[PDB]
From a paper:
Bestrophin-1 (Best1) and bestrophin-2 (Best2) are two members of the bestrophin family of calcium (Ca2+)-activated chloride (Cl−) channels with critical involvement in ocular physiology and direct pathological relevance. The bestrophins are a family of Ca2+-activated anion channels consisting of four members (Best1–4) in mammals. The overall architecture of hBest1 and hBest2 resembles the pentameric assembly previously shown by KpBest, cBest1 and bBest2, and retains the two landmark permeation constrictions, the neck and aperture, in the ion conducting pathway. Ample electrophysiological evidence indicates that the neck and aperture serve as dual Ca2+-dependent channel “gates”, as disrupting either of them partially impairs Ca2+-dependence while disrupting both makes the channel completely Ca2+-independent.
To elucidate the architecture of human bestrophins, we purified WT hBest1 and hBest2 for single-particle cryo-EM analysis in the absence of Ca2+ (EGTA), or after a 30 s spike of 1 μM or 5 mM Ca2+. Under both 1 μM and 5 mM Ca2+ conditions, most of the hBest1/hBest2 particles (~90–95%) were in a Ca2+-bound closed state, which is very similar to the Ca2+-unbound closed state. In both hBest1 and hBest2 structures, the neck is formed by the same set of hydrophobic residues (I76, F80 and F84) as those previously reported in bBest2 and cBest11, underlining a highly conserved neck in bestrophins. On the other hand, the hBest1 aperture exhibits several distinctive features compared to cBest1. Firstly, I205 is the narrowest point (radius 0.9 Å) within the cytosolic region of the ion conducting pathway, similar to I180 in KpBest, whereas the counterpart in cBest1 is V205 (radius 1.3 Å). Secondly, the Q208-N212 pair in hBest1 is connected by a water network in a similar manner to the salt bridge between the K208-E212 pair in h/bBest2, such that Q208 points directly into the central axis of hBest1 (radius 1.8 Å), whereas its counterpart in cBest1 points away from the central axis. This structural divergence is rooted from their different primary sequences: in cBest1, the side chain of Q208 fits in a pocket enabled by G209, whereas a serine at this position in hBest1 (S209) makes a hydrogen bond with Q208, causing the amino group of the Q208 side chain to point directly in towards the central axis. Consistent results were obtained from structural analysis of hBest1 Ca2+-bound datasets, except that residues 346–355 (yellow) and 368–378 (red) were relatively less disordered compared to their counterparts in hBest2, suggesting a stronger binding of this region to the channel periphery in hBest1. Notably, a direct contact between F354 and E300 in hBest1 is disrupted in hBest2 due to an insertion of F at position 353, which also offsets the residue numbers of hBest1 and hBest2 by one within this region.
Numbering used by the authors:
A (entry chain C), B (entry chain B), C (entry chain A), D (entry chain E), E (entry chain D): 2 to 377
Write the structure that this text describes.
């Protein structure tokens, strides 16, 4: 993830222009290789046409160049890129939305599972650990970074996500499919035992806990679905053919023909097809948007920071259910205890953001005494 | 936020034309700087071409101008702007939808947490204060205006959003990540204590309270997500390249060539490229839509009024849970107590809006006696 | 609202052609003023060019006309209109979806709040009245028609939406923001008192009531949001500039030049630029779609019938919770009491709509005896 | 509804080509009338131009034809059709999604409402009958086919959807608005009586029943909304003007001019403007998509089969709550009772669909011994 | 399903270029037949024009070719394909989202339905078997692969999805509609009996079980809806006409005319219309996206693996509710038991993915001492 939110807070003079000076996650970094190949092919064709070809061969090449330049179209490529890239971007955001966060669940485990004794601590930590374990099992299935960190279940044991007993239980349960679903079943059974054992005081609280846990299960299922059900290969191939064909055609149609022939549109021979290069940056960059986002769990600069998410989730969840269980700041009368209309102050830097309330769009409508009179 | 809802209530003669006379949040305010730079560059090129260049240099420049004007295309730029700006606008509205409002929660805290004594008052105020504190922690993380108002946690203490005890508790819990999640865990634990202490009469009410609070947590998580996971930089760079390249090409391709040469389309030499300037306003304004909305928590005219939202939420939430707790208007027979079909009157100004009921699209279908007879 | 659903039930010969004979909510009614202005400007330019201008001035004007006609483009305008109008239409439907209906809530108030005595009647009527009052407070904030009907809270008292005691309570609670949220807090507190007083038999029923009421609160909050957070002014100005600039350019570029000059495309001098007028109807009508829908709570023909909704909601809600409370039709064996497979008859007019069940797309697949045999 | 799902299961050679041989719900059936009118007008213009017009009149007509053919544009029409038709298709699917199915509710009524005696049977049947009655009241309000089947409430009585007592109760409750909402209030009151009478054992079950019933109410409200709030007439008129104007222009611009004049593009005089006819099929068919779908409750081939849905819902709901109440198949050990990893067999025809599990996209990543070592 | 997620994890040099070397689910496999037919027709026309036609016939053909090449347009086809294919892709993903997974339900059945005795085992297995049976009944109705595996209910009995007693019960209940809904009613009745029999301890747990089961019912209803309510045939025919007409026109308009005539754009006679073939691959591949996805339950390479889903669901669900019922790994202090801030290690391969926390976009804003001072 490359965050530039702070740089685009305001629509300042050349706000997006300044973003062209970025390297990480940039268009430049994504297509410089393809652009260099295109550059080399274009100038190989230029040298061949200018030097190797005979006069008749040069005339045939100049006819082919006019034909190819005539057969370059930007509407179909722009359209298919628009729709395809929009699909990729939509799926990208949906995949972020299906990253499981334990925060809702950990609030409920901290609140509902009772006991400051070692047994209550162990129960709360085990429940939230099952949640984190389910999350990491799916993430190591879909994220290259997470997999490289946990290339085997034994790595999960060494890293403390899974106990040796949990590892042994998983091996006993082995089916020939991804076992990421197991910790949810464990969570449901352990929550039930907690309720039957009196650690959860009422089955409505158990219902809430299982509802939050199942929300996480649905998110994990969606991550599995996106990882398994790729955008149909035929669609990806169609967009790829459109782009690569446009520029293969440009390799001949955008050659600078010999000025001596004075062909329409070839009066001057600049060596650099600057406009063609700008079209390359635009169209191939547009395609690189999809190439980066199609699998957002890879190692691209703008792929999701899955390892950070795993670490943060573990730290926060264990703190929430263990140290923060019935550990509250003292409850005392607040600063506005007997102030009907509290008005927190503004800083010198923030004074300009104090606003009057918007009362509704009708607030300023003017009506005469007669207009406002009720009729029988 | 620039509200013009009242000005566009009706589709009146030149309804949108009148909006062109607005300055705050206007296209003019957003691109006048870029337009002045473009204006200066265009006329520098004009003066250089007209005065400095020799006859041969002028002919070469006139060839380059014809080439550049030939290589100006509006379909790719319009397409990429359409899709990109639509993405930005969608994310903009989603970010508004993830601004947390305490209204649902405060109704439940006012209703369910019992006691007119000082302890009940303190409990209700503390719960709703935890909600407001969570909200402000995330908002100061994502909103420049809120941050400038609360540039440190100590500012939150001075402003009355957090007690000194709450501040000390937060410092004790410090992890190397944003601690905006803490007040939710506090809320869950305090609600649990209220239930165990008899201030909440039934665990179903506790379940409802925690459900509303967790809804707010999800909204805050979404604000964090949008602040962290920018639109991929490559996409922003692609759109920026498209626009800036179009107009860099225009800087040469839209020059008024010497009329004496009588080039096709250069018969008359107007000094102002009015059409090019209109295209600038259109395309760069379209891009400025995204530039303003990409981070709606900045200080642009049309960015969200986060400080007002924080102040209003605090005032309303404290009033709802403290002064309005079991404080109801007298319950008395309404004006339509024994009126089967109440017909509230209309004013002279509103009489034209009295309507007959729409009974359904089938209501006026005509059928003969034979057509309506049931068959065996 | 102009309903034409019945007229377009079937795809009949010239189904949409017949809709061009409509006046109310029509394109004609929305742009005739702008079209007349455009008509007058076009013919003023025609008369000036034909009569006032000298021969040299006429030649300069004919050059400018060719230039302007060359610089007319329909792709950018069509694109920006497509995206902008789609945004407006989406927001329009979302605003309809956020109009609160009390039907779900009134079913629960009728069912759950017990007692045929005067106290039960008063309690049910007061609860549903709080719902209707919240609805009308927001609607009078966002709807010009509702505001003109209720230009002050005292009008709400005279119309029977609010009691004098409720009015006094509201004035006591006054904060410098829209108080539309107050009746929800009152509802929560009154429902709690009903439960504690035994009128609501179980807290799960209280939970359901408050859930439905909070759904209405969220809808009202969305109405407030749409009324406050306009589509960014810059976007509206961009689309407006695109359209108005297209047609300002047409005012010169679409002039009929003197036939004697035999300019390419000006061989014949028709006086009416019929195609330009059709383009005006199309593009300015497309923009008028947005101009009407951008604020659907105004007084346009196709704005929502908010006053009718308020009246109907009041009548239905009071009937549902008061007259229909435990007032059921006699429960008796239905016509199909001992008929395993009930087959309600068809009329002569409806006989053609009797269908066989669709059993699924696989139902007709043919397989040989060998194909259907299970393998080991 | 024309179902062709089975015909397009696979992407076979000319899969969509074979669909052009369909008549019911076809493009041919929808526009043959308009196409015949267009055909007649085109050839009337041809005959007039070829025979009636004088030489000078023919030259004027040939100039007008060149002008009109120059002023034919396909981008605006394609754009506006794309956006408008997409809106219609979206609303079409949303309307299908708002067709109420009693299946969830009928499972809960079958399970929760106890008693195999006549009273329990009557209670279950009455509750599910109220659901079906609400559904049919709205459907007869919005569906021409349903209305023609039930053109009066008395028809609902004769068809067995409503008892005479229910009819009398409805007439007593009459307000000047659609009464489709009444059966929900009856359902809520009858469910409450069932709970108070001990037929529903616990208020949580009552809560579930009312939640499912209210889901159906929301769906019915959406059907009402779509029936009432048409797509704004101005938008429909805009698209209609675009299409009809394109083809009115084609009526002159696509005439075959006299070959003797050798106009550019009129060298050969084919009598049939085949390309213009293909454009007619395309554009007018695209518009006919909207014309059919704009009201999907009419009698078009591809309108919804509302009568079938009503009949099926009645049959299934009554069977589910009456015959299937506590009528279960014997519970016995399944075929895989002591089989840890059940492997149901495949047929000869299905053997090729047996697959290995997809274990996740990371499953095949290769790492060296050093790469997989944890670091301190 | 063709999964290529692992191949597109990163935006590597020619990432999408490498996907053009795929056969299964490829563009090549989907249109080679149509392309061969197009190839044969094009060269038959070439041979006829070059050999059979006389000089006058050749001149007429050359005029028709110029006319046809003039009448080839790519904007309407690209537009209609964009919108239509987007609709198909949206419906495709929605259909995947409506594939029922028993995981949420099986967690609740494993947790809530008590007893390690044979009766508890039978009850849990029967409940989850009803869920799987409902799923398979709908899937065999909509999926050709599933149907070919289970071409009759007796096949479901032989495969162990349904007992002989369940089969007999289904035959007794037979109505003239798809009976896929029956197992939900059985589930509701059996869950109710379990609660009344004490196997489910509290009606809130029963409520949760039925809520999850009804979610599955809604998904199955959606699968039925998509299978029944095809995309309107007229829309499919419109897109098909656009594509097939474009290429039928190309069959004449893209012929290589005799070079001796030196027609504009026919200077050189290449035999292969390479650009036309690329346009074929692009446009017909784009259409093949829809042709494959329109029914994603067929046997295409990229259709869903329904049989695998059925097998996996059965195996996992039975394991979860039977072997894993109250079978938990030992609960023991985790590796971070007394570690406030757990820091799981990284591998050598994963060290580069360790990140600092993103604290929010405001974290780096700089303010002076005066700017941060609160004002009165
Ligand atoms: C060929 C592909 C397009 C590439 C674009 C090349 C232009 C330069 C982009 C790099 C901007 C450097 C930003 C910077 O480091 O400086 C910061 C300065 C404050 O902010 C500014 O630069 C304010 C100036 C903003 C740009 C000028 C206004 C735009 C006018 C229309 C375009 C024609 C003008 C030549
Ligand atoms: C003018 C508007 C367009 C109308 C289209 C006219 C073409 C004929 C459409 C009717 C298809 C008849 C299908 C059929 O009953 O037969 C079934 C046969 C197996 O399936 C097949 O027909 C396989 C052949 C599929 C078509 C040929 C491949 C497409 C190649 C590009 C188009 C140019 C080829 C002329
Ligand atoms: C006519 C329809 C378009 C068809 C496209 C034909 C081009 C060849 C596609 C097949 C790629 C083979 C991939 C491969 O097996 O090799 C793997 C190699 C590492 O990865 C690479 O091939 C890296 C090279 C990536 C392509 C060259 C850079 C793109 C530059 C713009 C296009 C113009 C260049 C000719
Ligand atoms: Ca990636
Ligand atoms: Ca901003
Ligand atoms: Ca309006
Ligand atoms: Ca229809
Ligand atoms: Ca398929």
């Amino acid at each position: 993830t490359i965050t530039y939110t702070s740089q685009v807070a305001n629509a300042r003079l050349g706000s997006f222009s300044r973003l062209l000076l970025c390297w990480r996650g940039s268009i430049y970094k994504l297509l410089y290789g393809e652009f260099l190949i295109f550059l080399l092919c274009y100038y190989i064709i230029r040298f061949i046409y200018r030097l190797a070809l005979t006069e008749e061969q040069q005339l045939m090449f100049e006819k082919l160049t006019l034909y190819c330049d005539s057969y370059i179209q930007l509407i179909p490529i722009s359209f298919v890129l628009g729709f395809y890239v929009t699909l990729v971007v939509t799926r990208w955001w949906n995949q972020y939305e299906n990253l499981p966060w334990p925060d809702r669940l950990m609030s409920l485990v901290s609140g509902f599972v009772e006991g400051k004794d070692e047994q209550g601590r162990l129960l709360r930590r085990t429940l939230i650990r099952y949640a984190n374990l389910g999350n990491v099992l799916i993430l190591r299935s879909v994220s290259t970074a997470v997999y490289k960190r946990f290339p085997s279940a034994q790595h999960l044991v060494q890293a403390g996500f899974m106990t040796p007993a949990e590892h042994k239980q998983l091996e006993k349960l082995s089916l020939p499919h991804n076992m990421f679903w197991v910790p949810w079943v464990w969570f449901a059974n352990l929550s039930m035992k907690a309720w039957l054992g009196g650690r959860i005081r009422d089955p409505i609280l158990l219902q809430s806990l299982l509802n939050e846990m199942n929300t996480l299960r649905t998110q994990c299922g969606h991550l599995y679905a996106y990882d398994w059900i790729s955008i149909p290969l035929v669609y990806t191939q169609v967009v790829t053919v459109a782009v690569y064909s446009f520029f293969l055609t440009c390799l001949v149609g955008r050659q600078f023909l010999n000025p001596a022939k004075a062909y329409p549109g070839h009066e001057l021979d600049l060596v650099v097809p600057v406009f063609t290069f700008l079209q390359f940056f635009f169209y191939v960059g547009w395609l690189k948007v999809a190439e980066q986002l199609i699998n957002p769990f890879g190692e691209d600069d703008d792929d999701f920071e899955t390892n950070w998410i795993v670490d943060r989730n573990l730290q926060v969840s264990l703190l929430a259910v263990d140290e923060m269980h019935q550990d509250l700041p003292r409850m005392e009368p607040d600063m506005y205890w007997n102030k009907p209309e509290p008005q927190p102050p503004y800083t010198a830097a923030s004074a300009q953001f104090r606003r009057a309330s918007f009362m509704g769009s009708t607030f300023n409508i003017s009506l005469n005494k007669e207009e406002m009179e009720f009729q029988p």
